[PDB]
Amino acid sequence: GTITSQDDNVVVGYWHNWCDGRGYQGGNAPCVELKTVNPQYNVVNISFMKVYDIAEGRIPTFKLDPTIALSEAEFIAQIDTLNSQGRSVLIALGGADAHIELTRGDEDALAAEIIRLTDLYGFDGLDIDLEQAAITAKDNQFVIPAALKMVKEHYRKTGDNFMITMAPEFPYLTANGAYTPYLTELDGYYDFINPQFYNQGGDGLWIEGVGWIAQNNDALKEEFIYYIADSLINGTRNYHKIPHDKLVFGLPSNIDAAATGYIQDPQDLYKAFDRLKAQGQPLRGVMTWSVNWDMGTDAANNSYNQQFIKDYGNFIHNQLPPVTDMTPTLSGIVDTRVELDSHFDPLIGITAKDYQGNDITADVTVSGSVNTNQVGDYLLTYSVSSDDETTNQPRKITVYEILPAFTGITDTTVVIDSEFDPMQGVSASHPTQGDLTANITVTGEVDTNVVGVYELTYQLFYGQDNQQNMTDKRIVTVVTDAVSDDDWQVGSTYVKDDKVTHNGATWTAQWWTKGEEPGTTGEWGVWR
Amino acid sequence: GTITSQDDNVVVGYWHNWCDGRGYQGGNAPCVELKTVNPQYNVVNISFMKVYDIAEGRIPTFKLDPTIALSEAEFIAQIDTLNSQGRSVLIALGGADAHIELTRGDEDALAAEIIRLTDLYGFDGLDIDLEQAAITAKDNQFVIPAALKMVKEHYRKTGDNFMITMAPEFPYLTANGAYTPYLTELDGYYDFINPQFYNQGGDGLWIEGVGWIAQNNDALKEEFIYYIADSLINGTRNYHKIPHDKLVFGLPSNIDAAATGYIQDPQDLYKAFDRLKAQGQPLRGVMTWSVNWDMGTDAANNSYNQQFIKDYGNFIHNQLPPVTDMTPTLSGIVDTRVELDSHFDPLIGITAKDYQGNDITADVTVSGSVNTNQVGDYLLTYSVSSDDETTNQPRKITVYEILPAFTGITDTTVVIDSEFDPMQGVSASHPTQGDLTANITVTGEVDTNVVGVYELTYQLFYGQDNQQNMTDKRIVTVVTDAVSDDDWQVGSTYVKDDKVTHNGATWTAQWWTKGEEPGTTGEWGVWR
């Protein structure tokens, strides 16, 4: 077959390149010939392209499991058959223990190996299905989008749509989440995303009238499907936007296919989906792990007998064809903090694209304006238009100031007659304005010829025309060097003519004393 | 002691109500007397208040472990000591296997039990530390905030600040995440949040110039601390805003305290924190699991010897006192989709508060306006001001329309001379406008007296003044009932005078024939 792409809704099914996988609930998933896969699965993802031997290098490849009982040529033939029925067969990159850890540079090698495998086997496109660890290892986040841009472009040059899809676990689709770069860089190259809405247990989202809606809540499945898809297709509730024409809802086929997330009652999905249609945003399909599980058996060796395609095939296929959301996208708009009087440029870091990925960054315009010279908030509003759609998006700019700091204004003690320089070891700074030492004034003086405590007020005058002030204080204590009589202690014993210092004066004991405070013994007592 | 609350920065330390807990790396955490806890830990959280016997009911309580070798009275005494040093001792609600699953109604009982325990033991406040499962079980999300509002108010009535803190794992602090209701309902009641920035492995966030910054990345710890705190304190990058005066950074004390997130090199934290100060948003502190781990031993039975308070005590305590961010908050602003011509009110669902939790919803104002009657986007901007601060926040309103649907316009076959009603079983609908059947017109007619195929065009005219149209087509085929000669098949054998129907006519075989098409045998062949 040629490159066979899908225009209408999809029911995507993954296909195990292995036999007899064990189910979360004791069941079994046999390998199955491609040709035996129910026809209503119009996208069949071959699982998985990975690194098979670290010895062959870092570029992952695909090696058919011979134990499946298909020769190379026979597999090529069954792919051919699927392609003549108008169905697509994708190569699925990743899965559990992928060993995919790419380094910048590798993008050309990956691209070539993807083209080789697509030509050899007759694949119609590639599904990015990276396991948790691999989403972010080394430079995957750069290499895999780079590679795929080249594959897409290569097949475009011969008039074909090489399909790109992606199956991220739904909690990576938040606004700054780990799948960000895949979605961003492949914007306008990808055909649809099939997020996995299973295996995340209690993860989910808060919705005001209803509360917490968990992926593992069988009582609220309709709400789960409805709200999480509504969130994605509008890019609300802290999720990256996936237009609805491009959103396919990934589920397990039964309780053996995944730990959690199987839909017990299909109606929840019909109703959820219908509610999305009733707001003018019909989804593009369902996806499932996996056709093998749908043809598999439970732990009593009862066959599941295609229950999933039974519940959803007709439902998804008997829907109007998708209508493409042509809203363009903005990018790099983060609320920002600028220091008072700094230079700020509102376009730097902003970019934009049409719905096909073309850079339309030139077309961006901005409403409102900021005064770097006046502390406070300022609100801007970016806009870009393409193909008679318009996206806007707003941005908060907050001008703030910083206080300077003093240094060396520490209480200090000095000796009589020494020289004292009240700016010795003293300075002031600010991150913008730099060295402020010349902007400090000193109130008060120290007389180092005269024992005593001297209070200095330091003032720093900063800002524009020096009209902002801060104040610190310091105590400079001038002390005599001249040695004198030891202080009186209540514990010592003193004798006639012993002398002591106490409370500023020098006393002479008139006779034997212990524990009598000098100054407290009156006109004719022991201390004089 | 009285109720002892903290005004300045904090170094919070959790205290195990158990002995000899085992470390993630084989080490050991002994129980320790409160009095032995390093003084620079000025908030000590007693761990944990939970449900000890499902038999006593659903309200959790606190039961001191006697094996720690403190009597009830002696524990009260050591709490007293901490309180006379100006340090706070909090009761920590939750932890691993809390068994806390509350039902609406329970809020009064919980509140009373919290007051009883605070009075009995001398606690200065409560830390909400719910384990994953408990964040969202039953109605905790409602009961625990309700209860705590009453506790806070009760102690306010005697002039005391009963402190409320919370230690959510950092990935629940996204904009619509599971901790949403705690933060929201207790807004202005809580003293500080100490998120846990450990045990989440690869979770983290995307930052444009740097890429993916993981909590388990020891090469990027400075960036992790800086960016995640910057995100929280400004409420950017899909995180709920925690003002910086109220953000304390929770860490493990060593490699035995948690699976991941220990800071190998303290400098990363000093620098991260300093960068936050350099933007005018110094944090309020650090928190740690746990003082026991800080006094514990590793698996070689080497004592950790207070390494954590050694790395961070002086650092956090020698900082200027917190300056309170008085920005008010808006609430319930979600971008929204309204159908063409529906009534839409821009205040419904919006609310606001000052920085102390007072409802200032009356004070909200709104800029810009929406035309429910014209399909398209419209952008609004809410604002509220209190205590000379102003928050703004924008909202996108998208007016859209929906196409009607036809029903009963199915190709149909009828019998000669029957009555035929082209509106029988036909109708049209729209979700707003309802029954559109009267708005359908039919172009073309059926003549049921005359065999043939009849094409009808149905038109639905909808919308304001009926100026929008859609079209479907139907084929009505009138067929004779009158039985005739069997069709010719290429496989049968026919004989002189046999008759057949083929291509509209009736033929008579002139002699023996098999496989000759009537009409193809010329002037003098077998069929005439």
Ligand SMILES: CC(=O)N[C@H]1[C@H](O[C@H]2[C@H](O)[C@H]3[NH+]=C(C)O[C@H]3O[C@@H]2CO)O[C@H](CO)[C@@H](O)[C@@H]1O
């Ligand atoms: C139950 C089962 O089939 N487990 C196999 C496993 O499946 C996971 C798959 O790798 C991921 N990709 C998609 C799409 O769904 C994801 O979750 C599935 C778990 O329910 O994959 C393993 C190979 O990667 C295989 O060995 C398991 O048998």
Ligand SMILES: CC(=O)N[C@H]1[C@H](O[C@H]2[C@H](O)[C@H]3[NH+]=C(C)O[C@H]3O[C@@H]2CO)O[C@H](CO)[C@@H](O)[C@@H]1O
């Ligand atoms: C290593 C260890 O001390 N494990 C104990 C455990 O600690 C977790 C704690 O419950 C949570 N609350 C905060 C705050 O940090 C969280 O993570 C800690 C794990 O590093 O708590 C158990 C009781 O709940 C205890 O049995 C473990 O010994």
Ligand code: NA
């Ligand atoms: Na093909």
Ligand code: NA
């Ligand atoms: Na107290």
